[PDB]
Design a protein around this ligand. Sequence first.
Ligand SMILES: COc1ncc(-c2ccc3nccc(-c4ccnnc4)c3c2)cc1NS(=O)(=O)c1ccc(F)cc1F
Ligand SMILES: COc1ncc(-c2ccc3nccc(-c4ccnnc4)c3c2)cc1NS(=O)(=O)c1ccc(F)cc1F
Lengths: 828, 828
Amino acid sequence: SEESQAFQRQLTALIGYDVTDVSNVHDDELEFTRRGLVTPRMAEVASRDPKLYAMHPWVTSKPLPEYLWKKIANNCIFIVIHRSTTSQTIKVSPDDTPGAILQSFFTKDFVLRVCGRDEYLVGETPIKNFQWVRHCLKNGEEIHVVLDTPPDPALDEVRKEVSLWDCDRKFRVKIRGIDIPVLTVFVEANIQHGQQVLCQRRTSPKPFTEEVLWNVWLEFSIKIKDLPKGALLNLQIYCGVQLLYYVNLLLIDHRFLLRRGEYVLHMWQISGSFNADKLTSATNPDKENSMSISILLIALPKHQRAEMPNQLRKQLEAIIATDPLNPLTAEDKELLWHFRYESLKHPKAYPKLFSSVKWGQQEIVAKTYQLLARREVWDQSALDVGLTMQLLDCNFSDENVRAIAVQKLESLEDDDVLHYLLQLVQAVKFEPYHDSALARFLLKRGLRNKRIGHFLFWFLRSEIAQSRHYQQRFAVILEAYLRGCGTAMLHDFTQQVQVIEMLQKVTLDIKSLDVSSQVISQLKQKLENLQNLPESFRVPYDPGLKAGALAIEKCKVMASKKKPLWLEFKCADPTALSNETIGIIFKHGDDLRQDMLILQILRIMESIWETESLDLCLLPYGCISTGDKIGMIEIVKDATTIAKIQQSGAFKDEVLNHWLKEKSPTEEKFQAAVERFVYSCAGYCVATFVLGIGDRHNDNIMITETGNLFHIDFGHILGRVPFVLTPDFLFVMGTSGKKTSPHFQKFQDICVKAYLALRHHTNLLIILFSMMLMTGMPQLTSKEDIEYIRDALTVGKNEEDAKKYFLDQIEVCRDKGWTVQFNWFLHL
Amino acid sequence: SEESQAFQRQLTALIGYDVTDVSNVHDDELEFTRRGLVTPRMAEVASRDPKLYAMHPWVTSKPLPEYLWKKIANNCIFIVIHRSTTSQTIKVSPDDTPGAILQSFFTKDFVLRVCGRDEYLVGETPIKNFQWVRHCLKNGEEIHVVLDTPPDPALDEVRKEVSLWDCDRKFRVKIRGIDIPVLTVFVEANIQHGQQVLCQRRTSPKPFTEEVLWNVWLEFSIKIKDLPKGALLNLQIYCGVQLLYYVNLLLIDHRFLLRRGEYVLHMWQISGSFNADKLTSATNPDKENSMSISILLIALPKHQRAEMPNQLRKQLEAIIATDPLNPLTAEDKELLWHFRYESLKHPKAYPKLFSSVKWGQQEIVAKTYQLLARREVWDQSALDVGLTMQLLDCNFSDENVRAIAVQKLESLEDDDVLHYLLQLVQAVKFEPYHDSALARFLLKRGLRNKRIGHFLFWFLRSEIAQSRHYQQRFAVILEAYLRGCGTAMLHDFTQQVQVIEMLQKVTLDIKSLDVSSQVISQLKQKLENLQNLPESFRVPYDPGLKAGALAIEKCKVMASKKKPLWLEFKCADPTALSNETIGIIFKHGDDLRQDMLILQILRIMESIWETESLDLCLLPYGCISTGDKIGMIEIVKDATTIAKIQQSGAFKDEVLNHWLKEKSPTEEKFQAAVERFVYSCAGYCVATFVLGIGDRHNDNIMITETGNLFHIDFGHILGRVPFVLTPDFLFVMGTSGKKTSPHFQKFQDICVKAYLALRHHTNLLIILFSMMLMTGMPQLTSKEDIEYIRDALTVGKNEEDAKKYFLDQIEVCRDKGWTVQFNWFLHL
Ligand SMILES: COc1ncc(-c2ccc3nccc(-c4ccnnc4)c3c2)cc1NS(=O)(=O)c1ccc(F)cc1F
Ligand SMILES: COc1ncc(-c2ccc3nccc(-c4ccnnc4)c3c2)cc1NS(=O)(=O)c1ccc(F)cc1F
């Protein structure tokens, strides 16, 4: 067709990559996946509710936090409904539905929409179970909604559309040669399966030149029939010993066919590390410069007790109780496997049990499938996200194992998927094949809910624009989502990408030119030209918010070396309750993906703290990676850095407390800010400690006028003191040197409650941390790196040792005063 | 009948107890056993060869020892056949049969009989495989046989002849009271099974008087259906804590009936010890004085894999490799039981595996029987006597387990049964029931071979006359044997018992009267009266030898406090090659049973040494226990004590070497005596060390004129230096203080070869030692007692540490010289 052309081109433009381009594939897997994904797409689209999809209510089934209760006077919540010019304040009960609310208003068709936002309070859900309502309560804000007409669902219209088990020969592969357009070397051939090296063979070392031939058959010890679905041929080049290049080939393809024939693979260049890029089946796109290797190489079929000696059960339980990062000895595996049927009665033994499987033996793999067939304890088990995540990491290449993980994820409510979306999108990198159950799950949940969909779009598009290793795979999944999300979101994404693309250019043109008066007249000039750009666009980190017109006079070039744009937008929603502008930092030169991850962990940390009636007042500002080393960041209102305050490398102790009094008009407020400070401070001390990012210079720590403390720029320290608890912070709590005070004792108490809380989720955090390092920090992918968090969470320790451990830390910060901040200033 | 009367009375007179007397039984088990034993008796009698039974060839299938080879010149052995007055020396080949020999003699009906002995060289056996022939060779004696006529087999004529598994109630027993014709006390009720206490209940303590009543029901935790065949109700009385009396009752009888009703049991008096008397089901016969207990109390039915984790197989093998006296932890048992089918592939795991059985659970016991049903590795296994003995000790009460032990014993040749007869007879004490497979086995093997039979008679009769705990059981078995052994042996036993009974009296009458001239005229007088006594009788420790007339002039009263008779007899066989008299010590006042055991171990030690081409020249003189604290001992010819030599408490170093020169007429002989001394010395050092009986006073060590050293009186030290290696012994080897010599180096070498040899039979010796202490040393029955031999045999050590261990010992003896012998003299 012709309209399909100017539509596939639109898709490409949103995606940022051409899913038709076949200049870099050695098979048809990507294409097959495009087709395969049609069914799940159409299934979800066809069975989605029109009205609920249009309005996308943001709700939760969780209980209302205790601290959120202590803010409700006599089971009454006031809801101010605005019609056109007027407004009526109403008594509502937390337990009643919006439907009810409306009928109790007509006494003194339509649907309640949050004022100045694309957020609807609608559906058969208690007003208390709406996130927006919980947000207002938390901040002590007033709940304002307008009486508008339901969005026309027609705007969400979707456009019209020999057996392997018989070959007993040893596997072998011929290494022809290696070529590079521009020391001795050898090629190493590994047959891997989920980080496990099944078998390995090397070549003879040969003088390294622009072309090295071998023409040798490498015969492995593994029989062709013992090859597992998902096994990689891992080709690596060493020089003399150090790894220079690598590349991977799936030995069994997406149709269960053994791999056969001639291959010239373009390899990746290197910069025992656990980097997820090392696993990719994709070949390097840069054919011109890249090193390449030449190799020369039946379908896989499908599958269809004495009481334990007490001491063995003790040993088994001991093992199952260890942490995810706890290494299994061959003795442990032999035991887990020998007693596999007992192990299966424990959902928590699963990650370790399937790590005890000899995937290199077709008979063992078969018995394993027989295990998963007696899947009743697992299927009936209460969803455990940390446990489910462990089955989705780099240590599992089997699609049935990984599939029972995704199966458990289906019970997640939209609110929880949002909590784990980013890390789930990242976990797609550990999938052997492009079309996996995990991928389909992401796709289905994005199509079912606009909010998840919106972030799915930016998480994918973020990876596609800066990950050559995985962009092809991600681009296909993004396409499947764009073809089912609907006409209105398409138009919205189109608008958002256009705006960002325009703001990118300006950022680049301003950069190539400290902050002079000329560079300022050029920022203002370029902005004036652009504004003369969509009349409105959604904010990617806060999609309910629509930004509109620029406030050029408030725009500027910040004073860092990266010359970030500080932008200010008017809210395009007239029904907005304020004139406060939307503040967006636009930054080029950094890979903001790592920040997104840290911030997202912080959000997960807060929910853990909520399940324990705790609110450490963190501030995970919005941060979205939009392209190659560019992105945008939420400007937190009324905020100033701790360094700028002191600046008013000398440091004063009272200066901070002074600054709060100044900004608090009354005493009730100063005291409430001094509380906020104590909570937000403890929140960031505990958080940063766990994530090993506490030792920051105070230039990187900020504070709101209402006393809310919060760290910033988490990529900088990922690119001694356990955390920043400096005198000025302590002074606010009212303490000097060897002393104590009503707040300091409070602060000490919140920490230990925060700390011990997190430790109740050791495994979930260990897995999330491990995965964060393998998919976002190609630099921080060492064994000793990952195992930092085990120490920081005092694994194995009881709550007394742990408590006394953290307190010792808090002391280290005091005994060291300004010593570390002072060094941090010294410019050597 | 009437002839049966004067024949049952004869049996009683041989037995030394009336198997008809029912004045001491609470059931009919003994009687039932008398009847039960008829079949095995008649089976063996009916199927025994007349001629071979009459002549009882003493043969062996073992190879001729290497040292026995080096005594055969050019495959020729000379055999001097005597007819009447003449004699012909003949060339014979070691490999040819006696049948052959005869045909090679008529050239230059009948049967060859050793001169002056009831010993025949007959049958289809190589002349080399006759023990007599091996004896002559060993001693360098000349083989003299006479051509006599075959013994008439007619002389061997034999005279003409609710279910338990349904009762689910807890077992209980009522303790009425305790009575004694002549502090507080209580009764303790144990349900035991093979030294294992299944369940235990006590009474309330009550003031100890001549009659104490309780009238209380003791309810145990064990269900009636879980009671194992062979379980004992073990009633014990404690005073305040110390055990005073005990008695046992089989809870399930010989017909598989549960025990029911009223019992008054007469209990045994005491003198955590492992005494075999404590296990007896017999009641005390001394009704007049003995303490007794009153108690008040359905038939037992009959019965009809993932590879091991390497580490578990390692652990299992580790366990199975330990020694018999090595204690199993509950962890070990749980493992052996969990992996019972693997354990069954190892005959050596058997003792430990059946010690890992919960006999107190009818379901476990049942599975165990299912194990023994897959008895193929065991049944095909090469006979291991030590292993078979472990299944017959105090730790096994189950008749099926114990029965597979006796089954393995059937493959023993007569020569080997003789080696183990004594300890097998003792092991009958560990049998729960009177009619056991072990008992039948003994009976069958005694009836099949006259020599075994002869010793069977004296071993039984020894126990019957000094063991009230087991005499009833033993007396029944003896009766079964006497009714099938034949008319000639009956007459012989009759003769032997008469002689001994006469010699006993004289010993008693002489005792009640140092050595005066009057007591001498009274010994001679009493002997003169007796001789005016069978004209001939067999020597119980050497049955082939027939003693006849006394040599009164050589008779005397030895100079010990026990006033033993030193007797001298003429050999009643005219065809004897000498005029040397038979020398027999007749001793009253000692329990000679312990000696018999030690000596018998020494004999077992020599056979072990033979299987390793070694001959340490021990001298296990004959010693038979004939009655209550009486017995007889072989006088070793041309022998004098080491003390009497020195006496010629001062000690001289050369005196011993001097004594040898004196007695050796030539130099060739002195040198051959100095060799004999070095071997016999090392033999006794190693032996005594292992049995913890080395530290003897030299009054208890003797030497033959041909240099053969040998210890005596082994009951004395069972009633510091590791062994007697005194200067005088070392001088003979040619050494003084810090020195060495051709012999000393030799002696050191033989020891280590002797020692390491025995260690190859650690288990066999440990079991034999353990059993020797539990059936013969009521005094030496402690845990630390039994486990002495583990240390002396350096269990677990390799042959280097062991070798260097023994050498250190040999040194201890030198560094201490006469120090210990000197103290041994000091009369404090
Ligand atoms: C990705 O790294 C970042 N992470 C976070 C932020 C960030 C986020 C939210 C905010 N809300 C309010 C105010 C500010 C603000 C304004 C002016 N001065 N300071 C902070 C603010 C900054 C910026 C960056 N990048 S950055 O702007 O170059 C930069 C880097 C390091 C540094 F210490 C300072 C920086 F300004
Ligand atoms: C059961 O205890 C024994 N074990 C063994 C023998 C025994 C055995 C064989 C023999 N062959 C030849 C010569 C003698 C012999 C003659 C004279 N003097 N000494 C030994 C000899 C002794 C005796 C006893 N009992 S004993 O005769 O009372 C006795 C006890 C301790 C003691 F040192 C001395 C004793 F003479």
